[PDB]
Each structure stands twice: as C-alpha cells, then as structure tokens.
Amino acid sequence: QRCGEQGSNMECPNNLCCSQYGYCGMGGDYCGKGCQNGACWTSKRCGSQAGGATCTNNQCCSQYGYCGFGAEYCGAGCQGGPCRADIKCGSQAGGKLCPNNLCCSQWGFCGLGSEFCGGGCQSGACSTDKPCGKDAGGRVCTNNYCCSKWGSCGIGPGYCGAGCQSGGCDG
Amino acid sequence: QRCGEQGSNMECPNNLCCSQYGYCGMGGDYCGKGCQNGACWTSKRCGSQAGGATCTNNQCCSQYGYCGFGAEYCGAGCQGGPCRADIKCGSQAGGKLCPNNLCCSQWGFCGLGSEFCGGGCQSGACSTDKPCGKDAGGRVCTNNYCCSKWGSCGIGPGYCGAGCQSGGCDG
C-alpha cells in the first residue's frame, strides 16, 4: 500500500503521484515537492543527462533528458521508455537487450505481448521459460536474471536465494 | 510491500510481474498464472473490447483490445496508453478527457510533463493547481477530483475528506 522508497519502489496505478511520504494521490501534496513517481509536477531526469537512469512508470525520456509522454518525449529523439520509433535488439542488433524487461522478439524488436515474449523471444520477459545452468549445460540467463535451483530464470527470493546457479544472485 | 489487489493496485517497478500473491519479481512464479500487473504472460484486455478498461503500467491498448508495447500495440488503431498517434483531448475533441490522468495541453494533446501539465493545461494532472470551490466562484475540478476545504484539486484524504467541497468526496 506504500509507494516509492517506503514501498520498495512500487509505483501507483494510473499515474497517481507517490508523495514524499510514500502515499499515492493527486494534487500538490502528492505531485509537488518530493513526489517520488507518477505525474510529478517536476519531471524526474533520465537518459544520458542523468547518466543512463530510466524513467518511472514507463515514461518516455526526451532528447533533453526529461520524463513524460506525448510527441515531445516519445517522438523524435526519445532516449528510452516506449518511444515512437521501433526499438531493435538481440541477434539483429549486436546482441542489445531491451530496457525495462521488455521482450526482444524472434524478429529483433522490443515489446510486450505474445508476439514478442512467445516462441522465439530472445531476452527479457520471455513466456518460453527455458531452462538454465546445470541440467541445461551451464546455460546462463538473459538479462542476468537468476537461475534458480531448478535451472529456471527469474528474480525474487526463489531465483536469487539459496541454490542460485547463475547471474544476479543474492551473495 | 505488496502489489496488485493486495497492495491497493500498486504496480512493480520496471515491468516486473506482480504474482497472485502480491509480490514483485520475474519468472513463471510471478508472470505465469494469476499475474496481476507488469510483464504478465497473459496480456490483459482493454479498450472497447473490454468496455473501457485501461492497461496497467502505461501499456498500449491495441486495436484488438490487448495490452503490450511495440508497433502492434501502440501503432495504428492504438486505443490508449502511449499510442504513436498524438491523442486529442479537451476543447479540440469536444471536452474529452485524456486517459489515466494524463494532462490535456492547451493545444489539445495528451501527455505528461511541463508542455502538457503547465500553463493552459485543460484537464488531468495539471501542475497549475488552479483554485476551485467557494472561493473560486464554485469552479469544480476536472476529472471529478476533490475540491478540498482550501480550494485545491487533488485525490486523497486531505482533499476528499473533511470539508471536501465538490468531486469524489468521501461519504
């Protein structure tokens, strides 16, 4: 029920503003001073300008390094988030990965949905759930997900915890 | 702490799936069956096909009424989220509201950021904080936001509670 730092960086629904206090709402108390995510009155910084930082809430990072939506952000120059240009990846783009866990399709484009995540998906949130590590010949994971104890890719206590075969383990 | 139904529709950072248990992570335990938001393996329905329901995580609602990112979801016939087309609103669209609290700019386009939410913002999360209520000749807020006892528009207990003047006041 908490958002931002107080709620493990959780984001509010429907672009509600996460106040300084870790509560979702709308109006000055939430979006004004200290707003952590959502439609903050002051746009958070991103992309080169903030040295590669992502925008919260799938916002577009403009050519000037500001977070938002609309042509100004998502259009010409967009540096991240759901940009209007088609985003290339995988084998077709020198092995690049999609930002924010997007699935790299069999064709080499970044998205979400079964066309991207389904059979052939190369990296990110694939729905294919292909085995990793030991019982699958030292096969890591894309994105540095953790290869559980079952040679299963993911993130969370169960993949990064104890028995963690590869990637981003918890120690 | 929790996301989804368990955490007031709280969403996970970076497209992580919210499992049926209200926790954020990645893999088939979070994204598989019962996933609530983020990169779910089963895309939610939206738009006309699902009687106006909007996607979580600012995903695009395709022409076919499925949530996702990429050209098939945000391109032609996109019905919501950060569509590739400039989305019309406000006067320039007969008073229509932008979805998900987005700002309606002065020129009648939906977005987030100064250029949309600042000076001339018509509806949504404007940051101009124009006064409402008794002291502002009884103007009501757009979007059914609450007019607090002090003449400010927002959503939260300070706005919708004790002394709320108009909008979705608590009762």
Binding site: G113, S114, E115, G118, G119, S127 | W41, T42, S43, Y66
Partner: peptide, 8 residues
Amino acid sequence: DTYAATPR
C-alpha cells in the same frame, strides 16, 4: 503470437 486462451 499464440498462447493463453483469448476469447473471440
């Protein structure tokens, strides 16, 4: 593009 049952 297929998997999971979509109504039609």
